[PDB]
């Protein structure tokens, strides 16, 4: 039989447009993203598309038809239940996206990404020119171009389009992103993809023995109205665990943690408290593993994780050291030009003392620049940040415009 275990790696599907791309998952998978009642029946992720699957193979048959989602061969004249290669999850924002400071969390939960393109549109769209460059400062790895509506357009007016595309990411770091066409509404080539995902977004190297760390994305108060005193349940912390492992009953601190304000001046208090569960889904767990999004129940009053309190934070062991730093310096790389308006403008170096907002991990905070040389600048944070590792990658965003828009990257220095 196949195994019920936790998805061991995240896909962003990064679409142009609409549920153009929350029907692929769908497709891939067999449960709509956008608007998924697995949100009440386990599950809570505002706007967050997160679907999971199992994926094997009838070693009896031929590939691509080979794959499955399901332990089933028949598709391929065969009782044998196939092999089981591993269980994936998807992450995307619904429709038109919204993908400003919150596909920057992406960055941290996604091993790989997919880029859905219409094939019957003139590419690259706007939305598309843009969405591949977040993708660069995100510093997304494994990618695959899906080459969305085929079965709407001629083989040749397709074929066509493939090719602007390999055109396209010829020069960048996406010189050879695979194209996968398929028709995500009446199901066209979908296995293509699945040996796609098998082939391009591999699950990446992970050392169980490295300092846990999760990334919280969410959290909240999981009971209802009328409960009875006596039969609450501590507050629930929602996000991906990156790098390490989580057992259920281990001590566990929150940081930055608890904002305090006594003496007049602000403080952060780091917030313990223990590992009461573990959830991938609607099945329990005893260990969380970097891989999908992991919901933990905690001691912790309610009060302090009600509507998302901790979104931003970071989860590790109570013993962890790590420090947060209200004044970080970073080795940045910035941007020549971002589009956006009339033409794709150009972006100006970094200005002493002006207004950044940087992201670090599952927390965009924005600080003031405070020294600026050609590959390092210093920053004063709004809020401190916990650094968990030497250099975690950080999106620089300036607002341009009236929006916050992504000017660079850089790496956190200590």
Known sequence: AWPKVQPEVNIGVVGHVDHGKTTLVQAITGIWTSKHSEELKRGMTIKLGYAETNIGVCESCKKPEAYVTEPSCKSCGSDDEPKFL???????????????????????????AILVVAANEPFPQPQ?????????IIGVKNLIIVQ??????????????????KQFTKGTWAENVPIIPVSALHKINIDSLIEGIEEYIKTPY????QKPVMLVIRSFDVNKPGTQFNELKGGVIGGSIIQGLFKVDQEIKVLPGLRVEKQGKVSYEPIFTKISSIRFGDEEFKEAKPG???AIGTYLDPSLTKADNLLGSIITLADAEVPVLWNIRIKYNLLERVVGAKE???????????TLMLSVGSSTTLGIVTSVKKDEIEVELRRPVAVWSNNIRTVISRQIAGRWRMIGWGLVEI
């Open 86 to 112: 591993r269980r994936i999850s998807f992450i995307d924002a619904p429709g038109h996206e919204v993908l400003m400071a919150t596909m920057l969390s992406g960055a941290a939960l996604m091993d790989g």
């Open 128 to 136: 598309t020119r843009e969405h591949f460059v977040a993708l660069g």
């Open 148 to 165: 969305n509506k085929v079965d709407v357009v001629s083989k040749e007016e397709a074929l066509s389009q493939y090719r602007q595309i």
């Open 206 to 209: 992970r050392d169980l023995s």
């Open 292 to 294: 999908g999004l992991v």
């Open 344 to 354: 794709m403008l150009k972006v100006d170096p970094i200005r002493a003392k002006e």
